[PDB]
Amino acid sequence: SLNSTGLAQAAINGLNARFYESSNARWSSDEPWWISGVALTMVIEYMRRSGSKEYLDQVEDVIEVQRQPLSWWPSGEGEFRADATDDTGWWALAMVRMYDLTGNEDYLNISIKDEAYMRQWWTDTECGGGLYVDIQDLTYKNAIANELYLKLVASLANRAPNATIYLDRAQQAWTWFLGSGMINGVNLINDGLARDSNTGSCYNNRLPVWTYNQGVILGALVELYHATKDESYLLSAQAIADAVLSPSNGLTSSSGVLTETCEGSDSCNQDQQVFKGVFALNLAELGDAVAGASSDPDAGQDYREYLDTNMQSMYANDRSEIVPTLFDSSTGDLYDVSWSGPFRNATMPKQASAIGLYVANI
Ligand SMILES: OC[C@H]1O[C@H](O)[C@@H](O)[C@@H](O)[C@@H]1O
Numbered sequence: 085s086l087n088s089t090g091l092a093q094a095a096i097n098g099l100n101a102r103f104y105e106s107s108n109a110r111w112s113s114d115e116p117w118w119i120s121g122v123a124l125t126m127v128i129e130y131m132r133r134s135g136s137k138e139y140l141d142q143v144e145d146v147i148e149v150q151r152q153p154l155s156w157w158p159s160g161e162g163e164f165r166a167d168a169t170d171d172t173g174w175w176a177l178a179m180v181r182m183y184d185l186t187g188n189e190d191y192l193n194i195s196i197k198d199e200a201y202m203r204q205w206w207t208d209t210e211c212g213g214g215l216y217v218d219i220q221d222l223t224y225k226n227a228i229a230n231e232l233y234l235k236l237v238a239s240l241a242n243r244a245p246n247a248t249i250y251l252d253r254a255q256q257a258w259t260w261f262l263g264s265g266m267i268n269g270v271n272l273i274n275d276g277l278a279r280d281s282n283t284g285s286c287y288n289n290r291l292p293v294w295t296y297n298q299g300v301i302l303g304a305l306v307e308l309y310h311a312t313k314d315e316s317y318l319l320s321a322q323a324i325a326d327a328v329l330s331p332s333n334g335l336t337s338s339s340g341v342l343t344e345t346c347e348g349s350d351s352c353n354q355d356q357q358v359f360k361g362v363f364a365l366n367l368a369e370l371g372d373a374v375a376g377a378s379s380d381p382d383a384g385q386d387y388r389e390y391l392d393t394n395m396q397s398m399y400a401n402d403r404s405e406i407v408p409t410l411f412d413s414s415t416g417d418l419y420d421v422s423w424s425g426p427f428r429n430a431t432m433p434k435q436a437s438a439i440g441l442y443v444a445n446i
């Protein structure tokens with residue numbers, strides 16, 4: 085009796101009432117800019133899955149202003165080309181979804197500019213491949229920038245005119261990622277690569293297993309499946325998702341709820357607060373691809389039940405409503421970080437993550 089389209093809309097209204105800045109065409113300028121890109125993704129995906137165009141004018145406004153040359157990275161020349169490859173990647177994938185929503189080639193073109201910009205920091209000369217996250221310094225090849233890159237080139241292999249260079253890049257990037265060692269012995273992805281002092285060989289740095297690094301990779305593999313019709317991409321994706329769902333690996337509580345490793349210590353910072361909903365949206369993409377590739381009705385049923393289980397927990401334990409007034413009639417729902425633990429306060433990243441979970445259930 086829970087309607088995920090209605091709750092997604094109420095969560096987007098809450099996001100807007102507390103965090104949207106009209107004069108800036110952005111949410112929460114006091115929060116990292118890439119998380120406005122994630123938020124835009126969630127709003128776009130709500131519209132795609134539900135069929136609403138309620139927020140289209142707002143999204144267009146955000147795109148128009150945020151595509152301008154960034155005051156902190158003018159040499160990027162706008163179009164979301166930023167001072168880190170992952171920041172660019174979040175907006176690039178938002179533009180892929182906006183293209184999917186509208187069919188407007190402008191958004192696809194932006195994604196193509198973003199891919200060419202990110203590729204500049206791919207090297208074969210360290211780690212046999214992959215790109216750096218930190219453009220100014222070039223010290224870290226990490227999971228998230230390389231997952232976003234992979235999902236972007238794979239997305240373009242299905243949509244762009246010069247589709248075969250993107251397919252070759254996606255297949256080579258997946259080959260590199262699989263061979264990097266970041267996917268560990270329980271099929272989960274650690275934070276990134278360290279580099280050996282004497283030898284230049286790279287290895288899994290054993291930094292934490294973050295939920296969004298188990299999620300963006302699933303979307304990439306789903307796009308590789310669509311570009312190739314090779315289910316072995318779905319089989320790898322399902323292995324990573326199945327590891328997340330397994331309570332033995334500690335991302336899934338004994339209540340069956342998705343749980344960031346920092347929640348226990350109450351230490352989730354502004355980045356980590358958004359991670360879970362990015363995983364959920366990507367898990368929904370995997371579940372749709374698996375159910376479509378198979379005649380069995382129970383196909384992808386575990387992923388769908390998982391998202392449902394998480395949705396009901398967040399709805400019941402992690403929710404607070406804006407108090408309407410005589411003057412401001414704004415309504416919506418607000419959310420904290422723990423999809424099981426109690427609501428203490430809302431932040432823009434926490435809210436974006438919550439919207440992601442509802443949209444994953446539409
Ligand atoms: O996305 C990260 C980005 O977010 C902030 O809004 C900006 O001030 C930048 O300095 C920073 O690099």
Ligand SMILES: OC[C@H]1O[C@H](O)[C@@H](O)[C@@H](O)[C@@H]1O
Nearest residue numbers: 223224276277278279289291
């Ligand atoms: O794994 C190596 C890596 O660890 C840190 O988390 C990063 O900030 C990088 O500067 C460094 O190269």
Ligand SMILES: OC[C@H]1O[C@H](O)[C@@H](O)[C@@H](O)[C@@H]1O
Nearest residue numbers: 226227228275276294355356
């Ligand atoms: O919050 C964790 C997050 O922190 C930084 O932004 C980078 O080191 C990422 O690789 C990492 O996932």
